[PDB]
C-alpha cells in the first residue's frame, strides 16, 4: 500500500485538463499536490486561484494533515521497515538497518566501500520482509559510471535468490550532467506509482556538481540547484515511503573558497537546507585491514563505531 | 483561570450567525476579538461597520484595557510561571527558566542540541509547579521530521513520570510547506481553548522559508508571510498565556548567498517586526566538546554565559 | 498654573448638557475647546453653529491668544523645565535635557538602548526640581511589551528614591492594536486633568502601524491615521505641558514596501505632517561600546555627538 | 502711508457706520476704497446709498485713475528691498526681498526656511543705510519653531542691542486656520496702529494639511486658502509691507493623491494662482551647498545662487 | 554502430547557422550536445535559452536516456570489446584486457615499462576481433617525446601484419604545453567522428603540468585545468566508445611541494574528479628482472598481481 | 632549414612594441612563441589577453601542430642526423652516434673520460656530413674550468682540418654560478639563430648546484631551479634543432644527503622532470684500462656495452 493516484481527484469534480496539467507538472499522486503550497500550483499555467484553492482543499480533505497524539506517532514509527545492510555488526549499530522514509547520507574518503554498500543494499532490498528485506524492487541512479552487476549476481547467489529475477527487478540509469540527473527524478516519480519501490540510490549526489559548476562566482547557482535536487529527493521519500540513500566524497581540510562538500561538517545541503540528511554515516578505512562506520549524526541514535568487511559476496561481518 | 470562550459573548444581544462567522474566521475567544482592530473585523465579509463597533463595545467592556499602576503590573509579573530547562545552570542563567506568555527564540549553528532542549522542555512542561513545571499538556510543530519519542520516554523515565501518560499529552503535527505551517495555528487555537496547554514549540520557524521562497524577487512576499506568522504566534502567546519556543539555524561566518536569516543579528521577524522575539538565546559549540548558551537579548536579563551537557536522559548540568 | 478645567465654562451660562457632550467628545479642558476649530466643534451632533460660536468666543476671552512682544516669549521660554536624562554628557549635549511641551523622537536600530533611556527618564521624572527632575508622575503607553519594572527599581535605588513610592506613581498601558493605542490617548487626556503629569512615553510609536497596515493599497489610511495620532499627541503636549517622548525604529537597508518609514527622510508623520517631532535624536552603536547620540534636527541646537553608557543602574556617563 | 479711517469723518458720515466698518476690519480709508460694493453691503447696518457715497468719497481721496508709464517707473524705482543677509543671494534677487508683494520660499524638509525668516526679521529693523526697512517685524508662526536665541545671535553679528531688536518683534502662534485669520485681523489693526515692514507666515500650508484632512473636504480647503491669501494681498497693498510665506514641498509617490506638494501649482491653487508674486525654490545640494532658484518672477530671470547657514545666520558660501 | 553525426540535428528543424556554431564550439556529434547541460550550450554566444532548450528537446528523442532494467545493462556490458595487451598473464588478470569506453590509468616508477605497454597496445589495436583486437585506428598524443616507430614495426612483424599498413593506421601528435593538449583533443574529436577509432593514448597525462604549473601559488588553476582535461577525455570516451589509456608517473620519496601527485593514493583527478580513472594499474620492478602488474583499483575486478616481461617484440609472457 | 625568425611576424597587425617586448623576454623565433603557453606570454608585462591570443593563433597558423600519420614521422626521423663520437665501436653502439634534437646525457665516476668525449664531439661537429659530422659550429658552456684548447688542435690535426678554422668555429664560455648559467643560456638562445649551430655542450650540468645550493632545507629551490634549467635546455633543443650534450657526475657508493645528483637511478631532473634525458650513457673504468660505455636508458636502443679508449688524438677504438 502506498499513495493515492491523482485519478481519484477526477472523482471529486475537476475537469481532466487541469488534472493532465498537474500530471505534466510532476504531481502524480494526491499526496504530491496536497503537500505542495499554493505558490507552486499557481506558478504553472492554465490554473487560476479558485481552482487551485478548491483542489488543495479537496486534497486536504482526502489525506489527513491535522494534529495527533504522540502515542499515535510512536505506533506509526514502530511499524516502518528497516532494511538490513548485510552485516550483523552494522545492523546492530543502526538499530535495525536503514529506515524507510528518510535520507541516509553515507560519506567518506576515496576507496572506502560506499558503492559496495549500495550494491548490497540494492540486492537485499528484494528479500522477504521476514528476513530483513523490504519486498520491493530497487532503483539505481548512477552518476559515477560504477555499476557492475557482477557484484549483484554474487550477492544474490550468496543469499540463494534467483539471479534472473534479482537482475530483472533492479532498474538503472546514468546521469551525464546535473539537469539529466534532476529529470531522472521526474521519470522515477512517474514510474514509481506503477509498482512497489523500496529503495533509491543516488551514487553519488555531489560528483557532478564539483565539475559542472566549476567557478568562483558560480557557487550560488550550484547551491540553489543542489537545494532543489535535495528538496525533490525529500518529497519523493515522503510521498512514496521509499528509503533514499545517497553518497558524498570527503577529504581532509578543504579546497577552494568553501566550494565543495569536502568537510565532515557543513552537510550537502549547506546553508539553505541543513535538515536534508536525516542520518549521516562516516565511513573510514582505519588502520590495516579494517573498516569502520560511525554514526556522525542521528536524531535518535547515539554516536558509536562498528567493524565490517567486504568479501566477494558483498559486505559482511569482519571475519577473525 | 484562562480566557473567556466566545460563547460567553453570546450573552450580549448578538445573533449567532456572525458569531459563527467570527468563530470560523479564527477568533475562538472574546480576547482575540478585543485584541483586533476594526479593519480585521470588517475585512471578513457579512459584517457591517455598525455591527463591528457594537460587538467591539461589549468586547472591550468584558476585558480590562485601561491604565494600571506600575505596582499592579509588578504584582502581575511576580506571579508569572517559569518552566525549568532541566539544567540547574540554565535555570540560574534564565533566572527561573523559560517564562510563559512570551516568545523565546533559540538560535545556533548546525548540531548544537536545540531539538534536545525542545524535547526536554516539552516533557518537563508536564511536571507540577512544585517541581518547577507548568502543569499542562505541551504542543509540538515540527518542520524537519526530527521528532523522536524515544527521547521523551527517556526523560519521562528519568523524572519518574509515567511514560505512557507523558506520551499521551504531547500533541504533534508536521509542516510540509509554509501554508500548512500557517494553517496549523488555526486548529491550534481551537485545541488550546478546548483544554489547558502550557508550551508551544515550533521547530523550526525559518526552516521551510529558506526553501519554498527561493528567489531574488520573492524576498518581499517571504518577509510579509513571516511577519504574519510571527504576529499570529504573538497573538497566540498573548491570548492563552502559554510559552512559545522557536528555533533558528545560523551559519557561523557570513556565508552570503544573497539575503537570508542566518546571521547573529537581524531577528527572525526582520525589519517589518524586529520585536517578535522577546527572549533570544544563542547556542554555541565550545572548543572542547562543550556547549554554551548566551542570552543575546532580554529586556530585563543581562548578558551572561552558561555550561550544560546532553546525556541519554536529556539536557542537564555540565558533568566535569 | 495648570489648565483650567472645562467645568469653568459652566460659569459662562452655557447649558450643561452641551458641556457634557464636549466632555464625552474628548475636550476635557477649556484650552482644548479654544484650540479647536469650528468644524471639529460642529462635527459632533447636537450642537448648533450659534452655540459653538459663543463658547468659542467665551473661551478665547478666557485664555489670551493675541500678539505678544518677543521679550515676553523669551521670558516664557526661559522659565521652561528641562528633565535630566541621567547622563551629564547627554545633558550637556541637549543643553539642559528633554524639554517639556515638546515632542522628542528617538531614532535607533535594533539593540540601541532606547527602552533603557525611556525607563531612566520615567524614573527621573518624579525627581524634585532641585536635582533637575519634573516633580510629576510619569506615563508609559508601551506598545512593545518590553516594560520591565525591574530597571526602574534599580535606578530608584541609585537615586535614593523609595522603590514603593516611585513605582506607585507610574501609569502603564499596553497597545495591542492601533485603535486601542489611539483610545489610550483619550484615556490619558482624561487622567492628566486631575493630577500633575510631567512625561508621556510612547515606545515604540510605529511597530503596530508596520504590522497592522501591511499592504500596498493600505498606505494612505496608515498615513492619515498616523497623522491623526501625532496631531493628538501635539495637542496633548500643548494643553497640559508634558514632554512627549516617542521611539521610532530604523534600518540601514532597502525596504521594498513603498513608504515604509524606517530611514532618515522625514518625521514619523511623513508628508502629511513633517513637523510634529520638534526634537530628533539619532542613537547609533559605535565600535565596541559607548553608543553615540546625535542631534539630528533641532530648531535652536547644532549638530553634535556625545558618549553615554548603560549600566545596571540605568543610563549614565561613559567610563573609559 | 495709509490714511486713518477717521479722515472719513471729514465727509460727515454718522460715526456708527465708521465704527461698524472699523469692527468689520477696515481701519483705513484705502481698505474701504479697494473694497467693492458687495463687501461694503454684506456688512449689516449700511444702506446702499451710504455705501455708494462713502465709496465715492473714498475714490475722491485715493487716486485710482490712469497714470503714465513713466510715473509707474518712478514709483517703482523708490521701492525698498530688504537685504537677505547674504551678499550673493542679495545679488540674485537684484536688491533683495521687495515690499508690496508676496514672496513664497518653498523647499523640502530641512533646508533653512525658518533660519531665512529669522534673518529677514532681524535685518528688517536695520536703517535704510545698510539696506533694511527701519520698521518693526511680525511673526505669525504655525509650527512652534520660533527661537529668539537665533535672533539674538544674528543681532549680535550686526552690532545691535539685543534688547531693542527683541522689543521690536511681534509674535503670535496659530493652532488652527480660524485663529490664523483672526491673527491676520489683529495684525491689520496693529499695523494701522504703528509702522511695520515685514510679515512672516511660516508656514502657510502647515495647518491646512492636518485640519482639513479627507478627500471630500478639498473644496472648503481651497476656498479658505483663497480667502486667506486674498486677505494677505489686501494687507500687502494697503500698508506696503513685505509679506513672506513658507510652503513645504516633496516628491512623494503614494503618500498623498492631493495637497500642494508640487514645484508647480502655486500655493494659491487653481482659484487664485497669481497670489505669490515671487517664488523661490530652496533645494538641498549634493555635498553641503544649498541652492536658491528663482522659480517665477514678473521681471527677474531664472538663475541659481550659493548660500550657507552659519551660527550667525545666513551668509555667503565660505569655501 | 557509431555515433550519430550532428547533421541529423538539421533534420529536426534547426537552421544551419546554429548547427555550425555548435560544430565550431566542439560538439561534432548529437551525443555531445545531448550529454551537455543547458548552461554550457547557453555559454556559447549566438543561442537563446528557448533555442537551446529546443535543441536539447530534439536531441533527447534521438538518444535514449531513460531508465532500463539491469538485464539490459548486463547484455550491453557482455558485448563490450576488450583489447588484448599481448601477455597471457596480463590478459588473465584483466579478464579480457583493456576495456573500451573507460579510462585505464597505468602508473609506476621511472623506467617500469608503461611506454612499451602503450606501444604494444597501439599495434594490437589494429588486429581483428578474432585475435583479441579491436580492428580500429589508434592515436598517440605523446607529451614526453618518447615515440619510436621501430617498436611498432617490431610488434607488427611479430604478429605478421604488414608494417606499412600498421604504420599508416596510427595517428601521432606531440604536445608542448597544456593548451596544445586541449586543442589537440579538440582536433581529435573531429578526427574520431570522421572515421573509426578504437584506442587513444596519452603518455603522459601529468608530465607537462609539472613543467608548466609550478610554484606554491599556482595550485588551484592547475587542478581546475586537469579536471577540465579529464572531463574532456571522459566525454570523448563515452561519446565515441574508444579505449582511453593515460600514463602517470609516481615516486616513493615526494621531496617536492603540494603541487605534486607522487602517490599510489590521490588519483590524477584529485579531489575534484576522484572517479576520473575507472581502472587503475600499478606497475613495479621487483628484485632481479621481474616486472609485476597490480590492479590498484577496479569497480568489478579484485586485487591481484601478475608477472610479465618486455622483449624485442614488445610485452610478452615472462619466460622462466 | 632552421627556425622562422620573429622578423617574419609584425605582418599580422601586431605593433612593433609587443614584438620588441617578446624579443627582450627571450623569444627570438616564432617557434618559441608558438610552443609557449598563455601563462608565459601573459607574465611579461605589456600584453593583454586578446593580443596574446591573436599572436598565438597567428603563430599556430605559421607552423603545423596538428596530427600526422606515423609514416610521416618515420620519414622525418629517418633523415635526422647523428654525430659520430670519433670511435667506431661507440658509433655502432649508438646506431649512428649522438642524435640531434634530444638531450643526450653521459655520466660516470671521477676521471672516466667524459670531458675528452666532449672535446671530441665538439671538434667532430665541424666535419662534413659525408664524414659523419654535422656541418655546424659548436658551443661549450664549461662550468668546472676544464676546457683546454690544446686537445682540440691535436684532434683537428688528426682529422686533417685546419686548426685556426676549427678553433674559430667553437664558441666557449664559462659559468661561475647558477644564475650566470641561466643568463648565458639566454644569450646562447639569442645568438643561436644568426648561424648554423649543431652542438651545445654543458659540462657539467650539476657541478655548480652541488656547491652552491647547499643546506639540508634548501633542496626544494635547487630542484625547481634545475627543472627550469632543464626545461630551457629542452626548449632550446626542440626549437633550433641542435644537439644538446650534458655531463653529470656520479659516485658509486649510495648518497650523501636527502637529495643528490649521484646514484645511477634518480636522474638529474629528479622526480619533477624525469623525461629530460632522452638518452643516458654510463661510463666505467674496469680492471686495466677497459673503458666501457653502456646505454643506461633509451627509448629505442637496447642495453649494450662497448669498449673504447682515449689516446693523444682524442677518443678512438680500443687498441689491441
Ligand atoms: N570484486 C571485489 N571483491 C572484493 N572486494 C572488492 C572487489 N572490488 C572492489 N573491492 C573492494 O572495494 C574497495 C573500494 O570500494 P569501492 O566500492 O570499489 O569504491 P568506492 O570507495 O568509490 O565506493 C577496495 O578496497 C576493494 O577491496
Ligand atoms: N539589566 C541590564 N543591565 C544593563 N544593561 C542591560 C540590561 N538589560 C539589557 N541591557 C542592555 O540593553 C541593550 C539593548 O537596549 P534595549 O532597550 O533592551 O533594546 P532596544 O533599543 O532594541 O529597545 C543591550 O545592548 C544590553 O547591553
Ligand atoms: N543654531 C544653529 N546654528 C546654525 N545652523 C543651525 C542651527 N540650528 C539649526 N541649524 C541648521 O538648520 C538646518 C535646517 O533648517 P531649519 O530651518 O531648521 O529647517 P526647515 O527647512 O525644515 O524649517 C540644518 O541643516 C542645521 O544645520
Ligand atoms: N629495444 C628494446 N627492447 C627491449 N626492451 C627495451 C628496449 N628499449 C627499452 N627497453 C626496456 O625499457 C625499459 C625502460 O624503458 P621504458 O619501458 O620505455 O620505460 P618508461 O615507460 O618509464 O619510459 C628497460 O627496462 C628496458 O628493458
Ligand atoms: K540533522
Ligand atoms: K528585542
Ligand atoms: K522640524
Ligand atoms: K574509481
Ligand atoms: K680534475
Ligand atoms: K627517459
Ligand atoms: Mg564508489
Ligand atoms: Mg534540528
Ligand atoms: Mg525596544
Ligand atoms: Mg520649518
Ligand atoms: Mg615512458
Ligand atoms: Mg670532467
JSON list of N, CA, C and O in Angstrom, two decimals, chain A residues 20-40:
[
{"chain": "A", "resi": 20, "resn": "UNK", "atom": "N", "xyz": [-4.50, 16.78, -16.15]},
{"chain": "A", "resi": 20, "resn": "UNK", "atom": "CA", "xyz": [-3.37, 16.49, -17.03]},
{"chain": "A", "resi": 20, "resn": "UNK", "atom": "C", "xyz": [-2.29, 17.55, -16.93]},
{"chain": "A", "resi": 20, "resn": "UNK", "atom": "O", "xyz": [-1.10, 17.23, -17.07]},
{"chain": "A", "resi": 21, "resn": "UNK", "atom": "N", "xyz": [-2.66, 18.81, -16.70]},
{"chain": "A", "resi": 21, "resn": "UNK", "atom": "CA", "xyz": [-1.65, 19.84, -16.47]},
{"chain": "A", "resi": 21, "resn": "UNK", "atom": "C", "xyz": [-0.85, 19.55, -15.21]},
{"chain": "A", "resi": 21, "resn": "UNK", "atom": "O", "xyz": [0.38, 19.68, -15.21]},
{"chain": "A", "resi": 22, "resn": "UNK", "atom": "N", "xyz": [-1.53, 19.14, -14.14]},
{"chain": "A", "resi": 22, "resn": "UNK", "atom": "CA", "xyz": [-0.82, 18.74, -12.92]},
{"chain": "A", "resi": 22, "resn": "UNK", "atom": "C", "xyz": [0.06, 17.52, -13.18]},
{"chain": "A", "resi": 22, "resn": "UNK", "atom": "O", "xyz": [1.18, 17.43, -12.66]},
{"chain": "A", "resi": 23, "resn": "UNK", "atom": "N", "xyz": [-0.44, 16.57, -13.96]},
{"chain": "A", "resi": 23, "resn": "UNK", "atom": "CA", "xyz": [0.33, 15.37, -14.29]},
{"chain": "A", "resi": 23, "resn": "UNK", "atom": "C", "xyz": [1.61, 15.73, -15.05]},
{"chain": "A", "resi": 23, "resn": "UNK", "atom": "O", "xyz": [2.68, 15.19, -14.76]},
{"chain": "A", "resi": 24, "resn": "UNK", "atom": "N", "xyz": [1.51, 16.65, -16.01]},
{"chain": "A", "resi": 24, "resn": "UNK", "atom": "CA", "xyz": [2.69, 17.11, -16.73]},
{"chain": "A", "resi": 24, "resn": "UNK", "atom": "C", "xyz": [3.62, 17.89, -15.82]},
{"chain": "A", "resi": 24, "resn": "UNK", "atom": "O", "xyz": [4.85, 17.83, -15.98]},
{"chain": "A", "resi": 25, "resn": "UNK", "atom": "N", "xyz": [3.07, 18.63, -14.84]},
{"chain": "A", "resi": 25, "resn": "UNK", "atom": "CA", "xyz": [3.91, 19.40, -13.93]},
{"chain": "A", "resi": 25, "resn": "UNK", "atom": "C", "xyz": [4.84, 18.49, -13.13]},
{"chain": "A", "resi": 25, "resn": "UNK", "atom": "O", "xyz": [6.02, 18.81, -12.95]},
{"chain": "A", "resi": 26, "resn": "UNK", "atom": "N", "xyz": [4.33, 17.36, -12.65]},
{"chain": "A", "resi": 26, "resn": "UNK", "atom": "CA", "xyz": [5.16, 16.43, -11.91]},
{"chain": "A", "resi": 26, "resn": "UNK", "atom": "C", "xyz": [4.47, 15.78, -10.74]},
{"chain": "A", "resi": 26, "resn": "UNK", "atom": "O", "xyz": [5.02, 14.86, -10.11]},
{"chain": "A", "resi": 27, "resn": "UNK", "atom": "N", "xyz": [3.26, 16.24, -10.42]},
{"chain": "A", "resi": 27, "resn": "UNK", "atom": "CA", "xyz": [2.49, 15.70, -9.30]},
{"chain": "A", "resi": 27, "resn": "UNK", "atom": "C", "xyz": [1.67, 14.52, -9.81]},
{"chain": "A", "resi": 27, "resn": "UNK", "atom": "O", "xyz": [0.69, 14.71, -10.54]},
{"chain": "A", "resi": 28, "resn": "UNK", "atom": "N", "xyz": [2.06, 13.31, -9.42]},
{"chain": "A", "resi": 28, "resn": "UNK", "atom": "CA", "xyz": [1.43, 12.09, -9.91]},
{"chain": "A", "resi": 28, "resn": "UNK", "atom": "C", "xyz": [0.40, 11.51, -8.96]},
{"chain": "A", "resi": 28, "resn": "UNK", "atom": "O", "xyz": [-0.50, 10.79, -9.41]},
{"chain": "A", "resi": 29, "resn": "UNK", "atom": "N", "xyz": [0.51, 11.78, -7.66]},
{"chain": "A", "resi": 29, "resn": "UNK", "atom": "CA", "xyz": [-0.44, 11.31, -6.67]},
{"chain": "A", "resi": 29, "resn": "UNK", "atom": "C", "xyz": [-1.05, 12.49, -5.93]},
{"chain": "A", "resi": 29, "resn": "UNK", "atom": "O", "xyz": [-0.58, 13.63, -6.04]},
{"chain": "A", "resi": 30, "resn": "UNK", "atom": "N", "xyz": [-2.11, 12.22, -5.18]},
{"chain": "A", "resi": 30, "resn": "UNK", "atom": "CA", "xyz": [-2.77, 13.27, -4.41]},
{"chain": "A", "resi": 30, "resn": "UNK", "atom": "C", "xyz": [-1.86, 13.77, -3.30]},
{"chain": "A", "resi": 30, "resn": "UNK", "atom": "O", "xyz": [-2.00, 14.91, -2.84]},
{"chain": "A", "resi": 31, "resn": "UNK", "atom": "N", "xyz": [-0.93, 12.94, -2.83]},
{"chain": "A", "resi": 31, "resn": "UNK", "atom": "CA", "xyz": [-0.01, 13.37, -1.78]},
{"chain": "A", "resi": 31, "resn": "UNK", "atom": "C", "xyz": [0.90, 14.49, -2.27]},
{"chain": "A", "resi": 31, "resn": "UNK", "atom": "O", "xyz": [1.15, 15.46, -1.55]},
{"chain": "A", "resi": 32, "resn": "UNK", "atom": "N", "xyz": [1.40, 14.37, -3.50]},
{"chain": "A", "resi": 32, "resn": "UNK", "atom": "CA", "xyz": [2.32, 15.37, -4.04]},
{"chain": "A", "resi": 32, "resn": "UNK", "atom": "C", "xyz": [1.67, 16.72, -4.26]},
{"chain": "A", "resi": 32, "resn": "UNK", "atom": "O", "xyz": [2.36, 17.74, -4.20]},
{"chain": "A", "resi": 33, "resn": "UNK", "atom": "N", "xyz": [0.36, 16.75, -4.51]},
{"chain": "A", "resi": 33, "resn": "UNK", "atom": "CA", "xyz": [-0.32, 18.04, -4.68]},
{"chain": "A", "resi": 33, "resn": "UNK", "atom": "C", "xyz": [-0.83, 18.56, -3.34]},
{"chain": "A", "resi": 33, "resn": "UNK", "atom": "O", "xyz": [-0.90, 19.77, -3.13]},
{"chain": "A", "resi": 34, "resn": "UNK", "atom": "N", "xyz": [-1.20, 17.66, -2.42]},
{"chain": "A", "resi": 34, "resn": "UNK", "atom": "CA", "xyz": [-1.59, 18.10, -1.09]},
{"chain": "A", "resi": 34, "resn": "UNK", "atom": "C", "xyz": [-0.42, 18.72, -0.34]},
{"chain": "A", "resi": 34, "resn": "UNK", "atom": "O", "xyz": [-0.58, 19.74, 0.35]},
{"chain": "A", "resi": 35, "resn": "UNK", "atom": "N", "xyz": [0.77, 18.13, -0.47]},
{"chain": "A", "resi": 35, "resn": "UNK", "atom": "CA", "xyz": [1.94, 18.68, 0.21]},
{"chain": "A", "resi": 35, "resn": "UNK", "atom": "C", "xyz": [2.44, 19.97, -0.42]},
{"chain": "A", "resi": 35, "resn": "UNK", "atom": "O", "xyz": [3.14, 20.74, 0.24]},
{"chain": "A", "resi": 36, "resn": "UNK", "atom": "N", "xyz": [2.09, 20.23, -1.68]},
{"chain": "A", "resi": 36, "resn": "UNK", "atom": "CA", "xyz": [2.57, 21.42, -2.36]},
{"chain": "A", "resi": 36, "resn": "UNK", "atom": "C", "xyz": [1.82, 22.66, -1.88]},
{"chain": "A", "resi": 36, "resn": "UNK", "atom": "O", "xyz": [0.61, 22.60, -1.62]},
{"chain": "A", "resi": 37, "resn": "UNK", "atom": "N", "xyz": [2.50, 23.79, -1.76]},
{"chain": "A", "resi": 37, "resn": "UNK", "atom": "CA", "xyz": [1.83, 25.04, -1.41]},
{"chain": "A", "resi": 37, "resn": "UNK", "atom": "C", "xyz": [1.10, 25.64, -2.61]},
{"chain": "A", "resi": 37, "resn": "UNK", "atom": "O", "xyz": [1.21, 25.17, -3.75]},
{"chain": "A", "resi": 38, "resn": "UNK", "atom": "N", "xyz": [0.35, 26.71, -2.33]},
{"chain": "A", "resi": 38, "resn": "UNK", "atom": "CA", "xyz": [-0.41, 27.38, -3.38]},
{"chain": "A", "resi": 38, "resn": "UNK", "atom": "C", "xyz": [0.50, 27.99, -4.43]},
{"chain": "A", "resi": 38, "resn": "UNK", "atom": "O", "xyz": [0.12, 28.08, -5.61]},
{"chain": "A", "resi": 39, "resn": "UNK", "atom": "N", "xyz": [1.70, 28.42, -4.04]},
{"chain": "A", "resi": 39, "resn": "UNK", "atom": "CA", "xyz": [2.60, 29.10, -4.97]},
{"chain": "A", "resi": 39, "resn": "UNK", "atom": "C", "xyz": [3.02, 28.19, -6.11]},
{"chain": "A", "resi": 39, "resn": "UNK", "atom": "O", "xyz": [3.05, 28.61, -7.27]},
{"chain": "A", "resi": 40, "resn": "UNK", "atom": "N", "xyz": [3.36, 26.93, -5.80]},
{"chain": "A", "resi": 40, "resn": "UNK", "atom": "CA", "xyz": [3.81, 26.01, -6.85]},
{"chain": "A", "resi": 40, "resn": "UNK", "atom": "C", "xyz": [2.69, 25.71, -7.84]},
{"chain": "A", "resi": 40, "resn": "UNK", "atom": "O", "xyz": [2.92, 25.67, -9.05]}
]
